[PDB]
Amino acid sequence: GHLICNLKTTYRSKKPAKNLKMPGVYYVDRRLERIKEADKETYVEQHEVAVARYCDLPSKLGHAGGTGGSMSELITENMHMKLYMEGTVNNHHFKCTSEGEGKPYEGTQTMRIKVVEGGPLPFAFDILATSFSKTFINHTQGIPDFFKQSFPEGFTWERVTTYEDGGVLTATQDTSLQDGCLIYNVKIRGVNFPSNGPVMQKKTLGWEASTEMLYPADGGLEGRSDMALKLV
Amino acid sequence: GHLICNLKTTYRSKKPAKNLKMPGVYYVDRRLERIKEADKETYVEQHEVAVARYCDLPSKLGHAGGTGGSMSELITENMHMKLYMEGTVNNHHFKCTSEGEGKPYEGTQTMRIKVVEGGPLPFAFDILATSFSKTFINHTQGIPDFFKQSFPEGFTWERVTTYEDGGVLTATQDTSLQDGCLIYNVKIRGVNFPSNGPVMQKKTLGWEASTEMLYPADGGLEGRSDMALKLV
Amino acid sequence: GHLICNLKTTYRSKKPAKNLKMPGVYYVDRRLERIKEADKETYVEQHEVAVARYCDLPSKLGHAGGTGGSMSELITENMHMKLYMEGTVNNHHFKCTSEGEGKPYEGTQTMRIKVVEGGPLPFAFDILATSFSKTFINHTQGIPDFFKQSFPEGFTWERVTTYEDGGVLTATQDTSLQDGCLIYNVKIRGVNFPSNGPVMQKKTLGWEASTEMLYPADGGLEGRSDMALKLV
Amino acid sequence: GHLICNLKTTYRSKKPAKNLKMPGVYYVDRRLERIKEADKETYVEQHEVAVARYCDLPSKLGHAGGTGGSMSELITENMHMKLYMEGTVNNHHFKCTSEGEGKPYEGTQTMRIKVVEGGPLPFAFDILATSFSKTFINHTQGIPDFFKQSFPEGFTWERVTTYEDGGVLTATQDTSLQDGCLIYNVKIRGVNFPSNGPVMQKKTLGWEASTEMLYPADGGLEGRSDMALKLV
């Protein structure tokens, strides 16, 4: 079976608004997969593929179009990332680091992750999966790319993930570009994960594929998604 | 801008489970549009197109795959529907009726709707849109069709829609097939819609396209979606 | 153990706003218990004691200076109630009728309840308990009584109760005064109660005491409370 | 008017459970007040009074009894506190320190608070108020005191506060006793506070009084409350 959660996210550019070409309401389809783990999840490799689309269904009210996408020459066909993460789930403190690479225009990426403090964690690593990369979304289908456009200044995101069994996980993130490398700094605070639930019992088996709806809200973007966590 | 809401739905077949071929986790993309309205929304025409898909992104872990879709000869390529709806929003009681037709395998359908008691309504008709038809989803991409398979016995759905400004709308529905016509009986109970919000002030302009995730669960299938209501 | 739910309620007065005397933010302490049950919960007896208080704690800021309590000549020291209930929980349809007597100023009332239709219920009767009487709250500590003041016109209430395991029950209610008897007409719509949860498994044993915070909002009052359902 | 929020808290003792006398379900009534502020809320003085009670309404079960309260001589009639706080709201990072004193058995306390980093804050200080002391609750009315009993080992708490306009604030806290002084270490992570809302616009004026319901949940206590934030 599955345990469901809901994500509510706000994405904020550090680039002045007058310099951003904004998208309309759009959708990002994703498949985030665990590729490898070692030593009770103190080492994890994750891969994600993410493709943006405007709704392609026919419209009876007429197609409202745009002026195609955006350009961001600071973001190359191949990019590397480095990440630092710190936080708490329930009463348990931890730190992680990761490094990876991907193809920002093709929407694919890999992260190799180490738990460097607080390991092994008392909770399923799956609940951290979405906190490890918005620059790697394929927006080539004519959608202005809020994320790639944000450079050199970069952007932040902030999110609340609400699990249907009481766990709540907030996360805040800073994304910068430094000497050609993307740098992520992430902070996590999760609370009220049930002691008898699959997260604290480590009885999860990764995420199903997902769709996120993104929409303009106050100069930035907000996102909404429901995700399904596979259970043992 | 937009007002967001979240849908949590349980779909229950009246057909014995041993006679149902169940789908895996899948997604339905929709575009529900208002085609016409008259006399302050006491007459409304709605159209929907709905297309089911499994995740089509490549997988690194390779997938189980499926054994194809299902067959349901009772559901013809053209079908008619009749609907009766009764309920309350806040303190306001009302009844609606509708009739329509569509193409269940192509995923398209039209409803022509009349408010027959309690009109004109003091709230935006848009909050009733999703309560007016699961037999009309295109599952031809090889996804077993829980809804079409449920006939002749039929199925029910029950849903809570939670608006981000406090409105909550529950609905329960019975779907039957009588003399070749689909018959819908729907009951609505909405509460706490804010007096100063766009619903009670009638400042809404229809729904954005949406994606619903459906998965085998408590009962038959459960569904999750977030929808974005356009604002004046 | 306990199962926890949250109540959000809006109370609307039929009587014009100008006529009504409005209370400051205040809290109602309630103990609701089931005196008797029979025939698989087909017949239930419920007793409620409700007392209303302004905060009794000392204030350094020193805010108080209430103009005093309201007068409701229409409401006698002893009052009688007749109730009609129609509801659906999940896919189940039921009808309930009740007759009761109480001392409104005292804040004590007794209800004798019969399940006319759909008995025996497949779900715990406990979820229904809140739905079955705001006129019977002791406001004699100088708090203007929004409910007693509403007569002869009467009032409505509307509520969503959200259970921490997914059940959601909305209810709307009309309160009138006819030939000296209080008349309640209530409508219930519950959805998504888990098949493996204590409500559907009938493993509950009544409610703990509660406190509701009430505050002026838009037109009338809104209320917020959390309640704890005892488990077997 | 008011902006409402909901608090869900888990309280965990660091003392072995076989050394704790647990309370039954109970209620804590509080009045938290701002006494002084200076320099755009970069200095704040807060006072709280908190009194625990079992329900004191009569029962028809007439079946309620307890062994009375508990004893904790490490907690003296007067106690001092020192606090360190760090966190983020939306995209804004900050740190605070405080020191104060109180009467743990009378349920009163005062904290003098400084914003030491990230001041002045772009959000209402009110949203941090509940993160600055459970040892100072008057449980003298025969209720076992989970918090006072936890010493010398101490306890933690973790909380999610959900505002009805989208703001979500999680907090985690460690409480220890060091050389006779209570030491608090608090971490805050708030997200999605609306730019047009009273928190980000600094249009708030403190909290109404509140009641928290506490109940045993898996070796420790859980708490539930709704709080009302006064608006300008």
Author numbering:
A (entry chain B), B (entry chain A), C (entry chain C), D (entry chain F): 1 to 132, 136 to 235
Task: Provide text from the study.
Here we report the systematic evaluation of circular permutation sites in mCherry and mKate, and the development of highly efficient circularly permutated red fluorescent proteins (cp-RFPs).
Finally, crystallization and structural analysis of cp-mKate154-153 and cp-mKate168-167 revealed the expected tertiary structure previously reported for mKate, with only slight variations around the permutation point. A. Cartoon presentation of mKate (pH 7.0), cp-mKate154-153 and cp-mKate168-167. Each region tolerated circular permutation, but fluorescence varied markedly, with most efficient permutation sites tending to occur within the central loop regions. Future studies will be directed at determining the structural basis for fluorescence variation in circular permutants of mKate.
